[PDB]
Amino acid sequence: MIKLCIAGKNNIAVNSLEYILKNHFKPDQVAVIPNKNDFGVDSWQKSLLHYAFNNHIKVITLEEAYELKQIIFFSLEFDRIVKVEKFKSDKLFNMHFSALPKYKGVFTSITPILNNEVESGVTLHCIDNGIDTGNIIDQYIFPININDTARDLYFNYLSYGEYLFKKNIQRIINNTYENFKQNNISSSYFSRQDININHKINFKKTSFEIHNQIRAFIFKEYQLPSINKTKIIKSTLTNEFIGYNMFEEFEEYFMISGIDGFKIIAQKY
Amino acid sequence: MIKLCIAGKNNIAVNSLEYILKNHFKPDQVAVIPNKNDFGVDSWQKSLLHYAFNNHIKVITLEEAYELKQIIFFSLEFDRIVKVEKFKSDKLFNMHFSALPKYKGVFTSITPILNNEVESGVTLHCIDNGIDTGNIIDQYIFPININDTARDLYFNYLSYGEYLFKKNIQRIINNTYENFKQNNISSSYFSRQDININHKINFKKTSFEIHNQIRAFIFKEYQLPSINKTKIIKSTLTNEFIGYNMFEEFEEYFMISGIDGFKIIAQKYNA
Numbered sequence: 001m002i003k004l005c006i007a008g009k010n011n012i013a014v015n016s017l018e019y020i021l022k023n024h025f026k027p028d029q030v031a032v033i034p035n036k037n038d039f040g041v042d043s044w045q046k047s048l049l050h051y052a053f054n055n056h057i058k059v060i061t062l063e064e065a066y067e068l069k070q071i072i073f074f075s076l077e078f079d080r081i082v083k084v085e086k087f088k089s090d091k092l093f094n095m096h097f098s099a100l101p102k103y104k105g106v107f108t109s110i111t112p113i114l115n116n117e118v119e120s121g122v123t124l125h126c127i128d129n130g131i132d133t134g135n136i137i138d139q140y141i142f143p144i145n146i147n148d149t150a151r152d153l154y155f156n157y158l159s160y161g162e163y164l165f166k167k168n169i170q171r172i173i174n175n176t177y178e179n180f181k182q183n184n185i186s187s188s189y190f191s192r193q194d195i196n197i198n199h200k201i202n203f204k205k206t207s208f209e210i211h212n213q214i215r216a217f218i219f220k221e222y223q224l225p226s227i228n229k230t231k232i233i234k235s236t237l238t239n240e241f242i243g244y245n246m247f248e249e250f251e252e253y254f255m256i257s258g259i260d261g262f263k264i265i266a267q268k269y
Numbered sequence: 270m271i272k273l274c275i276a277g278k279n280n281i282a283v284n285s286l287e288y289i290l291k292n293h294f295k296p297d298q299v300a301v302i303p304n305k306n307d308f309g310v311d312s313w314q315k316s317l318l319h320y321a322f323n324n325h326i327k328v329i330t331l332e333e334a335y336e337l338k339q340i341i342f343f344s345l346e347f348d349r350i351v352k353v354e355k356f357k358s359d360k361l362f363n364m365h366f367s368a369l370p371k372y373k374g375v376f377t378s379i380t381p382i383l384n385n386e387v388e389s390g391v392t393l394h395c396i397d398n399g400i401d402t403g404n405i406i407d408q409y410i411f412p413i414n415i416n417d418t419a420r421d422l423y424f425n426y427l428s429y430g431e432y433l434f435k436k437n438i439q440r441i442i443n444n445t446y447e448n449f450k451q452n453n454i455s456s457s458y459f460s461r462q463d464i465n466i467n468h469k470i471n472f473k474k475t476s477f478e479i480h481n482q483i484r485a486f487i488f489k490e491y492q493l494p495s496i497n498k499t500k501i502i503k504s505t506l507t508n509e510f511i512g513y514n515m516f517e518e519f520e521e522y523f524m525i526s527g528i529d530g531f532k533i534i535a536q537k538y539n540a
């Protein structure tokens with residue numbers, strides 16, 4: 001019978017399924033539900049469908065997963081909201097790419113940077129009917145480095161999410177894990193509608209904040225930020241004072257300071 | 270000889286001037302620079318001008334203050350931007366109503382609540398030519414209570430600022446005080462343009478955030494926010510789960526929950 005279903009995408013889903021096959025369950029005991037963006041082609045992330053094809057793993061529908069008693073249903077960047085009443089099993093888990101209760105919703109590789117954070121986290125939690133609302137099983141908090149981009153932060157969510165899965169999965173399989181209700185205080189949420197991918201920079205902001213408005217949108221597979229109709233590939237912040245409210249466009253880079261006058265180099269594409 | 274000027278308003282300016290007359294200088298050694306808004310009347314805050322009237326303290330201008338060699342200039346919610354160059358004295362100080370380097374700029378009783386903070390602070394710093402950018406002498410960090418309004422947070426800035434001013438004034442007079450470069454990391458700023466007093470609430474937010482979007486604007490002397498064209502006087506965030514995305518108007522209050530399902534009681538204004 002199917003003991004475990006991985007729903008989702010990218011190296012966190014593929015590498016977690018690989019860990020299951022080596023340590024826990026046989027191919028005939030697992031199933032996948034790939035994301036709508038999965039066409040079975042490895043690119044800048046591995047395709048869960050391509051892995052399932054190579055490893056003789058069955059694809060199932062959400063409708064089928066509902067009917068499988070005792071299934072461990074694990075979302076690793078699954079693209080769909082499930083209704084937990086529809087499942088016969090109550091063994092429903094998600095890895096969320098933020099330090100819950102902060103930064104529920106989407107674009108979590110943008111929202112912490114854009115909102116001036118110096119740390120983020122990955123959080124293993126029970127699925128309930130809300131978005132990212134379910135009881136916490138485990139959390140790992142890690143730094144946002146001062147010149148990290150959304151892409152760097154994303155790759156960190158991928159590696160820390162994969163680590164936290166491997167840590168907890170035996171205890172999930174043995175039903176010997178605790179869960180804790182999320183706090184109401186410090187709970188925060190961002191929907192697709194809350195992020196403009198073509199963000200217009202506000203320069204009436206600190207250097208840190210102008211930096212953050214650039215680097216939060218550096219994720220080349222999706223987009224790069226533009227200054228004066230010119231793509232930016234990298235932003236570097238230093239504590240060097242060059243004066244307040246500077247803007248100097250050179251051939252290959254902009255030099256920028258905000259209200260507090262610290263040096264930003266925005267590298268052109 | 271004027272040794273010390275207090276430029277600004279409200280109980281921080283008045284009670285700081287009081288403590289100066291009480292422990293450090295005589296009336297003839299001190300002058301005030303009031304805000305454009307000061308019409309010598311006590312209300313929800315005391316009037317600096319009214320205090321200067323009662324205690325025979327002279328009003329000076331900025332132009333006067335610039336020429337006063339050796340003067341200690343203290344901005345306590347002063348309304349005027351100041352160029353350091355213009356001053357004979359380099360003993361220019363500001364109490365800023367945030368935990369610098371965060372929440373430089375304006376409406377610091379609103380911005381931390383609206384941006385989901387559970388702490389704020391008061392920072393005593395040297396004035397430089399930037400907005401709240403100058404080197405830090407001392408800082409007191411205090412909690413934003415879960416149901417604090419912007420008024421509550423402003424009242425805490427006044428009390429903790431008055432305390433920080435008192436704890437620090439001696440070493441400012443002796444000129445035996447340290448200052449420190451503000452970090453560039455975690456530096457943030459809001460200008461007046463960045464706050465829409467009348468911003469519509471986004472209900473596609475957590476209960477904490479809907480609660481914050483109401484209470485950040487509860488400050489009755491300036492405004493109350495509204496839901497369905499009724500003014501709200503208090504918001505209360507509970508830990509009670511009532512279901513995701515609830516909204517119910519009752520006679521005296523709105524029952525609201527966000528994307529995480531916690532009950533908020535928003536109390537209506539009621540003549």
Ligand SMILES: Cc1cn([C@H]2C[C@H](O)[C@@H](COP(=O)(O)OP(=O)(O)O[C@H]3O[C@H](C)[C@H](O)[C@H](N)[C@H]3O)O2)c(=O)[nH]c1=O
Nearest residue numbers: 077078079080105106107108109110150154197219222
């Ligand atoms: C779609 C998109 C993504 N990105 C970046 C920032 C995003 O955080 C990151 C990941 O994109 P994404 O859509 O895979 O993920 P996120 O939007 O981070 O996560 C949501 O969607 C996932 C598929 C899951 O359903 C998850 N539970 C959701 O929170 O890629 C862009 O910069 N521009 C874009 O237009």
Ligand SMILES: Cc1cn([C@H]2C[C@H](O)[C@@H](COP(=O)(O)OP(=O)(O)O[C@H]3O[C@H](C)[C@H](O)[C@H](N)[C@H]3O)O2)c(=O)[nH]c1=O
Nearest residue numbers: 346347348349374375376377378379419423488491492
């Ligand atoms: C003007 C105004 C103020 N308020 C609240 C929030 C503010 O933080 C608080 C105090 O307002 P305020 O006019 O004193 O100014 P703030 O914007 O707090 O402070 C600026 O102006 C002061 C006079 C100083 O120059 C200070 N350094 C500045 O940062 O009252 C409202 O809720 N609505 C309003 O319309």
Ligand SMILES: Nc1nc(=O)c2c([nH]1)NC[C@@H](CNc1ccc(C(=O)N[C@@H](CCC(=O)O)C(=O)O)cc1)N2C=O
Nearest residue numbers: 075078079080081082094106128129130131132191192
């Ligand atoms: N019930 C449930 N809770 C979850 O936390 C959860 C699941 N299911 N399933 C897997 C994963 C799904 N994550 C997401 C998160 C957001 C959207 C999404 O469509 N967001 C819309 C808002 C839609 C709405 O308002 O209902 C958007 O515009 O952001 C989709 C899937 N997940 C945990 O990761």
Ligand SMILES: Nc1nc(=O)c2c([nH]1)NC[C@@H](CNc1ccc(C(=O)N[C@@H](CCC(=O)O)C(=O)O)cc1)N2C=O
Nearest residue numbers: 344347348349350351363375397398399400401460461
């Ligand atoms: N040089 C200096 N630094 C300071 O930090 C400082 C002073 N002077 N003077 C006293 C006080 C004045 N504070 C302020 C702060 C903001 C505005 C203001 O109207 N700001 C506008 C935009 C100004 C700009 O863009 O340059 C706004 O809309 O926010 C006025 C007075 N102050 C420390 O408090």
